[PDB]
């Protein structure tokens, strides 16, 4: 039995790191950093500090308003019963506006609250995105986080804003609930003929599978070479060590090709962003330009034809 | 680019000739295709 580098056996404690000095024009960091023993078992023990600039407080306030609108509406749906609130929490939702209103502003009685929560949640997410951009720039680091985040926002925006805008109805958008938004997801595929046959849904799943596959490969590869300092990836990129060589050689000998320490994270970055990028395009296509994906599959020779175990059933409604 | 002006002109001479030859063959191909089935509909629509 050898050490598998799953949990840190010996943690050390010292002064907390306050972060690299930010350039002038930045707010002071908030919070007093502390050490969490159980977090240090897996990774860094230090919790905080956090940066709360104008973007952070504005995004928190906008997100707080959206959550409060959702939560108070779900609480009101169970007659303000906290017992029924907890019991029915996965089933409750802030329902999207009724289809009769189209894109017009709906009353509070028929989905006006959903539009406000969607607006404030979108503002919170957008303000969080620029904060992700700003925090990277202020440290001098590249803005890879912000643009990977933009891909996730892209699917979020098409799901609740862009596609309902194209369909001309806020009713096409996702309810703010746990089970109801699963119902919407199931109903969306059912309405547009088996979203399995959406080729961009296929692509999104391939990248979602690939992203999970890549992190399984990359996480295991780095842990298997962490005995040679493989976890210090940026140091390996600048100054290649035997950990990078062993990591590349393992995959070169396995599947005939390999990446570098830097380029594997380019594979990781692109596979993740392509999951939501392809997914957002696929969602944007259905209802606007394709209305039955299975029939699109049979039109393009995608859907298999199965042998008839029963005679074809005539539609009794003529 | 690591190219002197002399080689730049000499490549451009061959590049233009090859582009013209490629375009000329394509122009003949388009003329043959037009004689087969013209692709501009007209008021009646083919």
């Amino acid at each position: 039995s050898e050490y598998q580098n799953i949990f840190t056996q010996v943690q050390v404690r010292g002064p907390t790191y306050p972060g690299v000095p930010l350039p002038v024009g930045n707010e002071p960091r908030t919070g007093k950093p502390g050490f969490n023993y159980w977090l240090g078992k897996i990774g860094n023990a230090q919790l905080g500090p956090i940066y709360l600039g104008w973007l952070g407080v504005a995004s928190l306030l906008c997100g707080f308003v959206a959550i409060e609108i959702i939560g108070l509406n779900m609480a009101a749906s169970v007659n303000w019963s906290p017992i029924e609130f907890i019991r029915q929490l996965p089933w409750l939702a802030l329902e999207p506006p009724a289809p009769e209103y189209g894109l017009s502003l709906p009353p509070l009685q028929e989905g006006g609250w959903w539009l406000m929560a969607g607006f404030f949640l979108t503002a919170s997410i957008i303000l969080w995105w620029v904060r992700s951009y700003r925090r990277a720039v202020q440290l001098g680091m590249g803005t890879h986080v912000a643009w990977a985040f933009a891909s996730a926002i892209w699917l979020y925006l098409v799901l609740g804003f862009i596609r309902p805008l194209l369909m001309g109805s806020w009713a096409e958008a996702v309810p703010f609930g746990i089970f109801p938004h699963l119902d919407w997801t199931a109903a969306f595929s059912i309405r547009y003929g088996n979203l399995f046959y959406n080729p961009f849904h296929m692509l999104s799943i391939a990248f979602l599978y690939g992203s999970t596959l890549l992190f399984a490969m990359h996480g295991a590869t780095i842990l298997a070479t962490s005995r040679f300092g493989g976890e210090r990836e940026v140091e390996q990129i600048a100054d290649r060590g035997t950990a990078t060589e062993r990591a590349g050689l393992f995959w070169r000998w396995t599947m005939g090709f390999n990446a570098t320490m830097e380029s594997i994270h380019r594979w990781a970055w692109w596979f993740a962003v392509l999951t939501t990028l392809t997914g957002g395009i696929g969602i944007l296509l259905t209802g606007t330009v394709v209305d039955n994906w299975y029939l699109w599959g049979v039109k393009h020779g995608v859907a298999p034809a199965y042998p008839e175990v029963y005679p074809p059933t005539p539609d009794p409604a003529a | 680019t690591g190219l002197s002006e002399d080689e730049a002109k000499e490549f451009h001479k061959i590049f233009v000739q090859s582009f013209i030859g490629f375009t000329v063959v394509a122009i003949i191909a388009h003329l043959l295709a037009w004689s087969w089935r013209p692709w501009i509909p007209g008021p009646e629509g083919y």
Binding site: - | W39, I40, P41, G42, P43, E44, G45, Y46
Partner: protein
Amino acid sequence: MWRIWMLFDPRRTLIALFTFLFVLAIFIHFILLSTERFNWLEGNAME
């Protein structure tokens, strides 16, 4: 306007410009193909 190349590298500007021009051209050709009047391959009648 020659000063604009003091801020923009001609190589990256030309590559971006050519990519933009081709994508726009393909986009406009496809938009016409989606219209009944201007689809020259389907050849619908005028009016």
